[PDB]
Design an enzyme around this catalytic site. Structure first.
Site, PDB file in Angstrom:
ATOM      1  N   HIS A 140      16.822  67.704  49.544  1.00  7.87           N
ATOM      2  CA  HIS A 140      17.001  69.100  49.911  1.00  7.87           C
ATOM      3  C   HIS A 140      16.071  70.011  49.149  1.00  7.87           C
ATOM      4  O   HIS A 140      16.194  71.231  49.269  1.00  7.87           O
ATOM      5  CB  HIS A 140      18.443  69.533  49.743  1.00  7.87           C
ATOM      6  CG  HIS A 140      19.345  68.962  50.789  1.00  7.87           C
ATOM      7  ND1 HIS A 140      20.717  68.947  50.671  1.00  7.87           N
ATOM      8  CD2 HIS A 140      19.064  68.414  51.993  1.00  7.87           C
ATOM      9  CE1 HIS A 140      21.243  68.405  51.756  1.00  7.87           C
ATOM     10  NE2 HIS A 140      20.261  68.073  52.573  1.00  7.87           N
ATOM     11  N   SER A 167      14.162  67.335  55.617  1.00 11.31           N
ATOM     12  CA  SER A 167      14.058  65.980  56.129  1.00 11.31           C
ATOM     13  C   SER A 167      12.645  65.645  56.591  1.00 11.31           C
ATOM     14  O   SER A 167      11.796  66.518  56.778  1.00 11.31           O
ATOM     15  CB  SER A 167      15.023  65.765  57.294  1.00 11.31           C
ATOM     16  OG  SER A 167      16.368  65.862  56.871  1.00 11.31           O
ATOM     17  N   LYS A 175      26.710  63.230  66.387  1.00 14.39           N
ATOM     18  CA  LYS A 175      26.133  61.895  66.456  1.00 14.39           C
ATOM     19  C   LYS A 175      26.633  61.049  65.305  1.00 14.39           C
ATOM     20  O   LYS A 175      26.879  59.849  65.465  1.00 14.39           O
ATOM     21  CB  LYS A 175      24.608  61.966  66.460  1.00 14.39           C
ATOM     22  CG  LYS A 175      23.931  60.616  66.678  1.00 14.39           C
ATOM     23  CD  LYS A 175      22.420  60.756  66.835  1.00 14.39           C
ATOM     24  CE  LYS A 175      21.744  59.413  67.107  1.00 14.39           C
ATOM     25  NZ  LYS A 175      20.261  59.552  67.242  1.00 14.39           N
ATOM     26  N   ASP A 176      26.846  61.674  64.154  1.00 11.73           N
ATOM     27  CA  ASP A 176      27.558  60.996  63.087  1.00 11.73           C
ATOM     28  C   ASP A 176      28.896  60.490  63.581  1.00 11.73           C
ATOM     29  O   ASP A 176      29.197  59.299  63.469  1.00 11.73           O
ATOM     30  CB  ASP A 176      27.765  61.941  61.917  1.00 11.73           C
ATOM     31  CG  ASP A 176      26.476  62.403  61.334  1.00 11.73           C
ATOM     32  OD1 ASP A 176      25.446  61.762  61.624  1.00 11.73           O
ATOM     33  OD2 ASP A 176      26.493  63.424  60.621  1.00 11.73           O
ATOM     34  N   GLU A 214      25.895  33.723  47.643  1.00 13.39           N
ATOM     35  CA  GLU A 214      26.294  34.085  48.985  1.00 13.39           C
ATOM     36  C   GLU A 214      25.083  34.551  49.779  1.00 13.39           C
ATOM     37  O   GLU A 214      23.972  34.673  49.257  1.00 13.39           O
ATOM     38  CB  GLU A 214      27.390  35.133  48.937  1.00 13.39           C
ATOM     39  CG  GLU A 214      27.028  36.324  48.126  1.00 13.39           C
ATOM     40  CD  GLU A 214      28.207  37.228  47.970  1.00 13.39           C
ATOM     41  OE1 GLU A 214      29.124  37.155  48.811  1.00 13.39           O
ATOM     42  OE2 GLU A 214      28.231  37.993  46.988  1.00 13.39           O
TER      43      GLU A 214
HETATM   44  C1  HEM Z   1      30.517  48.838  47.822  1.00 20.40           C
HETATM   45  C2  HEM Z   1      31.614  48.726  47.080  1.00 20.40           C
HETATM   46  C3  HEM Z   1      32.034  47.403  46.432  1.00 20.40           C
HETATM   47  C4  HEM Z   1      31.594  46.158  46.549  1.00 20.40           C
HETATM   48  C5  HEM Z   1      30.481  45.598  47.444  1.00 20.40           C
HETATM   49  C6  HEM Z   1      32.382  45.347  45.665  1.00 20.40           C
HETATM   50  C7  HEM Z   1      32.259  44.019  45.488  1.00 20.40           C
HETATM   51  C8  HEM Z   1      33.336  43.221  45.513  1.00 20.40           C
HETATM   52  C9  HEM Z   1      33.262  41.807  45.631  1.00 20.40           C
HETATM   53  C10 HEM Z   1      31.964  41.003  45.742  1.00 20.40           C
HETATM   54  C11 HEM Z   1      34.485  41.357  45.629  1.00 20.40           C
HETATM   55  C12 HEM Z   1      34.955  39.915  45.743  1.00 20.40           C
HETATM   56  C13 HEM Z   1      34.669  39.492  47.169  1.00 20.40           C
HETATM   57  C14 HEM Z   1      35.937  38.914  47.703  1.00 20.40           C
HETATM   58  O1  HEM Z   1      36.960  38.993  46.977  1.00 20.40           O
HETATM   59  O2  HEM Z   1      35.919  38.384  48.840  1.00 20.40           O
HETATM   60  C15 HEM Z   1      35.344  42.476  45.525  1.00 20.40           C
HETATM   61  C16 HEM Z   1      36.672  42.385  45.478  1.00 20.40           C
HETATM   62  C17 HEM Z   1      37.233  43.298  44.677  1.00 20.40           C
HETATM   63  N1  HEM Z   1      36.578  44.442  44.322  1.00 20.40           N
HETATM   64 FE1  HEM Z   1      34.914  45.276  44.583  1.00 20.40          FE
HETATM   65  N2  HEM Z   1      33.295  46.111  45.017  1.00 20.40           N
HETATM   66  C18 HEM Z   1      33.073  47.373  45.476  1.00 20.40           C
HETATM   67  C19 HEM Z   1      33.754  48.446  45.083  1.00 20.40           C
HETATM   68  C20 HEM Z   1      34.908  48.158  44.484  1.00 20.40           C
HETATM   69  C21 HEM Z   1      35.947  49.103  44.305  1.00 20.40           C
HETATM   70  C22 HEM Z   1      35.799  50.559  44.759  1.00 20.40           C
HETATM   71  C23 HEM Z   1      36.929  48.471  43.693  1.00 20.40           C
HETATM   72  C24 HEM Z   1      38.306  48.949  43.225  1.00 20.40           C
HETATM   73  C25 HEM Z   1      38.754  50.167  43.504  1.00 20.40           C
HETATM   74  C26 HEM Z   1      36.495  47.137  43.509  1.00 20.40           C
HETATM   75  C27 HEM Z   1      37.256  46.237  42.921  1.00 20.40           C
HETATM   76  C28 HEM Z   1      37.460  45.078  43.520  1.00 20.40           C
HETATM   77  C29 HEM Z   1      38.652  44.339  43.352  1.00 20.40           C
HETATM   78  C30 HEM Z   1      39.858  44.767  42.503  1.00 20.40           C
HETATM   79  C31 HEM Z   1      38.533  43.253  44.062  1.00 20.40           C
HETATM   80  C32 HEM Z   1      39.625  42.177  44.132  1.00 20.40           C
HETATM   81  C33 HEM Z   1      39.915  41.786  45.566  1.00 20.40           C
HETATM   82  C34 HEM Z   1      39.362  40.403  45.714  1.00 20.40           C
HETATM   83  O3  HEM Z   1      38.521  40.027  44.858  1.00 20.40           O
HETATM   84  O4  HEM Z   1      39.764  39.691  46.668  1.00 20.40           O
HETATM   85  N3  HEM Z   1      35.258  46.936  43.996  1.00 20.40           N
HETATM   86  N4  HEM Z   1      34.631  43.633  45.444  1.00 20.40           N
END
Ligand code: HEM
Ligand code: HEM
Ligand code: FES
Lengths: 106, 54, 67, 379, 62, 49, 81
Positions: free
Chosen positions: D201, D205, D227-228, D271
């Protein structure tokens, strides 16, 4: 070291110059230039008659993009058709920093 | 069939949402698709006129 | 008794061409193996292939045929 | 601005960075992505959060809790997959945002780029730790590998291993350290997000055509917002469609196997999305060589803006380079499938082939091309 | 000639903002109640004898 | 001069109800609008579900 | 300054437009648009597809190339010696 092949070169030009839509899309070589800070000073020195007629195309131009509708192929811009009008004025400013820079060395 | 069930007890239940969402889904997109265009209806309707005093 | 549909359907498939075809190779292997089994030679490789296309036939059949 | 509800709280004056943000006319759906990105980020935040509640990291127990999660917890199963199944989608949301970048070559904006750079680099590292959480075998060894990959630094490498470890093993500290990081981290990213927007900004754009559009602009609030509205929900579909019918499709990682420290799986690949990077690791026989190969490999993106040589911006008017552009595309897509395979020789050579191929595509060809077009085009 | 429902309905509802919004808030209630019910069969009508809703009739109330 | 302008015709995009200029635009207008809004209201609803 | 006011200077452009109610959301959508498919779908397809085709070959090519390399030991050396 080219004479007949020189003639033989221009085709690809004329071809390649038709291979980029702006010839179909109504532009020139000038108006498609990347932005330069000299172009600023360059654009400054353009008289409106020149300046303005550059403008109205762009307005018309972009519009088709939104609708993706290319101009009727006859009305397309042509290879013989060209104007370098921008460059000559561009050319001056270039030298200017050169001179300055040159002096600016020592 | 037994273990196929094991890892996913919700399996039978969970499929419900699948059919649930689909008919729910075909609703809104053309609807959205209508609205969007409805706005864009103006832009793609433009005309331009260069009538220089020149 | 009950005889199954399972092995029942086997023979109709292994009846098919490529089955006995490679099944011969199984012999061809094993035949060559027979005295030469002193050498590393073993036919497990081939039999896989035999069984490979074997049940693809069996696939289309006996599942529908069972309970 | 007489009695305008924008200025009455001073706050909403800031809110006029949006309503009245001017906007370009002709815009591909390919500009939905920037806004599209943040969408995933939000929806995530909730999912792992409520998931975080019933889950616990304790090296002995932790994984067990997860079983409890999808089973006895209210709707526990839908939720796990959600947070997960967003992840890859989000990444595919990522590269596209990048994708638009070069195809229109908008990287002309200078530090903004570098911002967009760092912004990414964190994100992948994030889920990396996130992927440890499930405590699967593949997690465990995958975790075990990359630190063991780190150590090769000539002098100081050693401690840093067991320093990050906090011991000789992969045990508690290694895990439960991260459950902070994999959690604490993304917020700061969100904090960073706005910054990356600010700079944009400054200038407003960019366009498709590499042509300053200033002659025409549009109030943002009515239109692109719409469009969003479309572009946003579309994601959800496949996102919600994959998750229910074919949950484990992209769930290609198979291990709910409680990780055996002794036992090793028949195969270890990270992965899906790492793999090309991981693939390139294999290439160098020098273990150190692959490191400066691997990590640097992405750092090239920083270096692109240095190589713009042309007199017109958007690729869509330079046909030749466009080939390279696509030529590079599959080359990336290539390394995938090679990476998607073990270390047998026919692939090996093939893998060994595309590596140096890769750089040449970007590093030399691209800068080489435009020069001649200028001359070809009489510039 | 009489106004088609729209001419009526617009004058009736969509004109006045609330009124417009009102039936919108109304419609979903019966809808989902009708919607939830009517769709289930489509699922269920396909899924027959494989579920104790059908199965347990074999042994239910003994 | 200024005088020579005349608005170009879009009518393809229109619908024929107002295609007659010797219609007062007000008459179809009554029913004309709601159908547009009808989507508006309509499209809104399922969302709430 | 104020984002729109000081943008640029422009002279003697004219614009023509209607209410959205004046027109329809499908002004010959099918009929008019369906041709347009080609001019864009032909435009890039010259420039883009072929590289992938090469890939797809390699996909089968190397696989096949891989396949023999292991799959049959009694190939180069048959099980004789
Ligand atoms: C773009 C955002 C996020 C990504 C890509 C990410 C990445 C991941 C990954 C790779 C896993 C394990 C994959 C799976 O369990 O199948 C996962 C699960 C988890 N993520 Fe994240 N995380 C992100 C944001 C967060 C946030 C915002 C939280 C908590 C508020 C968080 C906490 C957790 C927790 C607690 C798990 C446990 C559930 C599980 O593993 O099955 N992550 N997340
Ligand atoms: C999740 C990560 C990101 C988010 C949330 C994000 C957000 C945005 C948003 C909202 C925009 C404005 C709309 C648009 O131009 O796309 C944008 C633009 C941009 N971002 Fe980011 N972006 C992200 C990642 C990146 C990355 C990884 C890069 C570069 C490596 C980057 C560089 C840019 C550039 C160059 C633009 C302007 C592109 C153009 O002019 O079309 N962004 N980003
Ligand atoms: S590091 Fe163990 S084999 Fe390469």
């Amino acid at each position: 070291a080219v004479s007949a092949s020189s003639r033989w070169l221009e085709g690809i030009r004329k071809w390649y110059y038709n291979a980029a839509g702006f010839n179909k899309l109504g532009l020139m070589r000038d108006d498609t230039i990347h932005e330069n800070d000299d172009v600023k000073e360059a654009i400054r020195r353009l008289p409106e008659n020149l300046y303005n007629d550059r403008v109205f195309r762009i307005k018309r131009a972009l519009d088709l993009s939104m609708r993706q509708q290319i101009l009727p192929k006859e009305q397309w811009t042509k290879y013989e058709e060209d104007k370098s009008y921008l460059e000559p004025y561009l050319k001056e400013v270039i030298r200017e920093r050169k001179e300055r820079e040159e002096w600016a060395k020592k | 069939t037994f273990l196929r069930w094991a890892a996913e007890p919700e399996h039978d239940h969970r499929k419900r949402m699948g059919l649930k969402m689909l008919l729910m889904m075909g609703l809104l997109l053309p609807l959205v698709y209508a609205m969007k265009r409805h706005k864009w209806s103006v832009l793609k309707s433009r005309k331009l006129a260069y009538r220089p005093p020149k | 008794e009950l005889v199954d549909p399972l092995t029942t359907v086997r023979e109709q498939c292994e009846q098919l061409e490529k089955c006995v075809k490679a099944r011969e190779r199984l012999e061809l292997c094993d035949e060559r193996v027979s005295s030469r089994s002193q050498t590393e030679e073993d036919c497990t490789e081939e039999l896989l292939d035999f069984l490979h296309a074997r049940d693809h036939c069996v696939a289309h059949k006996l599942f529908n045929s069972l309970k | 601005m007489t009695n305008i509800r924008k200025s009455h709280p001073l706050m909403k004056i800031v809110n006029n960075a949006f309503i009245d943000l001017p906007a370009p006319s002709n815009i591909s759906s390919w500009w939905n992505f920037g806004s599209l990105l943040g969408i995933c980020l939000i929806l995530q935040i909730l999912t792992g959060l409520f998931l975080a509640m019933h889950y616990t990291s304790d090296t002995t127990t932790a994984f067990s809790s997860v079983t409890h999660i999808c089973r006895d917890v209210n709707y526990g199963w839908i939720i796990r997959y959600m947070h997960a199944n967003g992840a890859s989608m989000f990444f595919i949301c990522l590269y596209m945002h990048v994708g638009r970048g070069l195809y229109y070559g908008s990287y002309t904006f200078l530090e903004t780029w570098n911002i967009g750079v760092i912004l990414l680099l964190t994100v992948m590292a994030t889920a990396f730790m996130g992927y440890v959480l499930p405590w699967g075998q593949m997690s465990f060894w995958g975790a075990t590998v990359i630190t063991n990959l780190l150590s090769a630094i000539p002098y100081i490498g050693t401690n840093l291993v067991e320093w990050i470890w906090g011991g000789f093993s992969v045990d508690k500290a290694t895990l439960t350290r991260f459950f902070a990081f994999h959690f604490i981290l993304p917020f700061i990213i969100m904090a960073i997000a706005m910054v990356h927007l600010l700079f944009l900004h400054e200038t407003g754009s960019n366009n498709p055509t590499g042509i300053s559009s200033d002659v025409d602009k549009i109030p943002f609030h009515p239109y692109y917002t719409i469009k969003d509205i479309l572009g946003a929900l579309l994601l959800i579909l496949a996102l919600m469609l994959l998750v229910l019918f074919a949950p484990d499709l992209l769930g290609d990682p198979d291990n709910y196997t409680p990780a055996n420290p002794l036992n090793t799986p028949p195969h270890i690949k990270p992965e899906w999305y790492f793999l090309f990077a991981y693939a390139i690791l294999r290439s160098i026989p020098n273990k150190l060589g692959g490191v400066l190969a691997l990590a640097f490999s992405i750092l090239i993106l920083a270096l692109i803006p240095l190589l713009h040589t042309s007199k017109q911006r958007s690729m869509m008017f330079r046909p030749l380079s466009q080939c390279l552009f696509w030529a590079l595309v599959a080359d990336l897509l290539t390394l995938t499938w090679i990476g998607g395979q073990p270390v047998e020789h026919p692939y090996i050579t093939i893998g060994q082939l595309a590596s140096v191929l890769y750089f040449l595509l970007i590093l030399v060809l691209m800068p080489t091309a435009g020069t001649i077009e200028n001359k070809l085009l009489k510039w | 000639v009489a106004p088609t429902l729209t001419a009526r309905l617009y004058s009736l509802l969509f004109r006045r903002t609330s009124t417009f919004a009102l039936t919108i808030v109304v419609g979903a209630l019966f809808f989902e109640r009708a919607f939830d019910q009517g769709a289930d069969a489509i699922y269920e009508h396909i899924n027959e004898g494989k579920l104790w809703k059908h199965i347990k009739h074999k042994y239910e109330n003994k | 001069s200024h005088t020579d302008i005349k608005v170009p015709d879009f009518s393809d995009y229109r619908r024929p109800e107002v295609l007659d200029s010797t219609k007062s635009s007000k008459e179809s207008s009554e029913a004309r609008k709601g159908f547009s809004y009808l989507v508006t209201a309509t499209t809104t609803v399922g969302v709430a579900y | 300054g104020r984002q729109f006011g000081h943008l640029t200077r422009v002279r003697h452009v004219i614009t023509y437009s209607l209410s959205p109610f004046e027109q329809r959301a499908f002004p010959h959508y099918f009929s008019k648009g369906i041709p347009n498919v080609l001019r864009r779908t032909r435009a890039c397809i010259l420039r883009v597809a072929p590289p992938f085709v090469a890939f797809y070959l390699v996909y089968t090519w190397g696989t096949q190339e891989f396949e023999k390399s292991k799959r049959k030991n009694p190939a180069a050396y048959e099980n004789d010696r």
